[PDB]
Amino acid sequence: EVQLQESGGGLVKPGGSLKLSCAASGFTFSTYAMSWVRQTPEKRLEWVASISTGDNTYYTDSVRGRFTISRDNARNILYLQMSSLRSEDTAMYFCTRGRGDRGDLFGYWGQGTLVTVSSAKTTAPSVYPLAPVCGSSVTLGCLVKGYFPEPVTLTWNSGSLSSGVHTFPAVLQSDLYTLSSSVTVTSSTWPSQSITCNVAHPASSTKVDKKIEPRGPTIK
Amino acid sequence: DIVMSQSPSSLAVSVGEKVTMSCKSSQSLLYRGNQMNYLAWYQQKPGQSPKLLIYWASTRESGVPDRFTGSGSGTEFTLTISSVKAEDLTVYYCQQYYTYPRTFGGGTKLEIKRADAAPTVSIFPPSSEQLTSGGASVVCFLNNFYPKDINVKWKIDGSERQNGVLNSWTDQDSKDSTYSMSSTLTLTKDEYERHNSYTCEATHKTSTSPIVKSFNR
């Protein structure tokens, strides 16, 4: 029935511009007030703007004079023109339709389009093997430091090693992402069997393998 | 602003339990003209948009199961689930539409109770490979613990360091309902080599004393 689909999201530099579009179908579009609501990386929900059935517009202060909400009833689409983009504007942007023919209560939401505002350069991660230091099981690891943008793909032994794995959500520090992963196995499994960290970063077009070498005295 | 506050922010639950979520309003949402509360609840499952659950504080949206029940008035609102189902284990947001700006509460996340488990702690020196580039990250994994509340301190030669620590926390594990955490201390290579003892210490309610993992450079 009711379908909403956002588009036009992407990566931009601070001070940049974007125009989101929201394609609606499965209802009489002119009847309803529409809105844009964003979800920040901290997963807070922030109402951004609303447009009435008669083109009256409402904004939250932070985007006033920078964003413009509009509708095109002939084409069933809602727009959000974004200008002078800021770091804070980074969010998933949802378009919504009023529940009833009355107000802007967020009755129906699209699946969202992602907007990222960052001054970071595209950066391949540095991938470091984490070998155990001075039993029954042993925990190995992989550090994927300082990359942009998201995402990376990390597997262990090309996907063969899947259980006992924790891969921690990427986190931002100094405009770059860092991620890590642990893999826990039987002590008899390793280092008898080889274990390798595979990291792909499809944006710097890099693919890296890192074998976890056991620590020990083939020291000089 | 009109400020919406949800309590608590997270709640440990058992399937089949009755649970209750609070949403508080910094100003009343009760409109005298029609005695309606301009308050809505949303559910947001992982990867999905929020979906409207309740509106006018107590009106279920169509196709919303009877176990969901909203109540309250003025500034104090409640979302109740009669018998929680596994698919209800997620985030719920309240929202006022009494005035502009439209404002949301910070959300309440429901999670699964499971019985306390101690972290398995592992410390890792910087890789020789990172050292070559003049960097030195020290990594500490704290894996498979419950409840999720945990504290990590880095101590270097017996003294505590806070700058340059990067922490990350998993979501509750779907298989064992436990939590894991990663802590990374990044130093300059030079500063890493001015010290010997590196220590990751985890404070968790499963022990009256820290779980300590250390190495000497």
Numbering used by the authors:
A (entry chain H): 1 to 134, 139 to 224
B (entry chain L): 1 to 217
Tell me, in the authors' exact words, what the paper reports.
The CCR5 is also one of the main entry co-receptors for HIV, and CCR5 deficiency is strongly linked to protection against infection. In this study, we have characterised two monoclonal antibodies against CCR5 which recognise a short linear epitope in the N-terminal region of the receptor. One antibody to this domain, RoAb13 combines potent HIV blocking activity with the ability to block chemokine induced monocyte migration. The CCR5 sequence 8 to 16 therefore represents a linear epitope recognised by two monoclonal antibodies, which also recognise CCR5 expressed at the cell surface.
Despite several attempts, we were unable to co-crystallise RoAb13 with peptides coding the linear epitope recognised by the antibody. We were, however, able to obtain high quality crystals of the RoAb13 Fab fragment itself. The crystals diffracting to 2.1 Å were obtained in the vapour diffusion experiments with 20% (w/v) PEG2K MME, 0.01M Nickel Chloride and 0.1M Tris pH 7.5 after 7 days. A comparison of the RoAb13 heavy and light chain amino acid sequence with the closest germ line sequences shows that the antibody (especially the heavy chain) has been modified by somatic cell hypermutation in several places, indicative of antigen-driven selection. The distribution of the selected amino acids suggest that the linear epitope may adopt an extended conformation across the face of the antibody, with potential contact residues in both heavy and light chain. The presence of an extended area of positive charge in the vicinity of non-template amino acids is suggestive of a possible site of tyrosine sulphate binding, but targeted mutagenesis of the antibody will be required to confirm this hypothesis. Interestingly, RoAb13 bound more strongly (heteroclytic binding) to sulphated than non-sulphated forms of the peptide. RoAb13 recognised an overlapping core epitope between aa8 (proline) and 13(asparagine). However, neither antibody showed any cross reaction with macaque CCR5, suggesting that the single change of asparagine to aspartic acid at position 13 abolished reactivity.
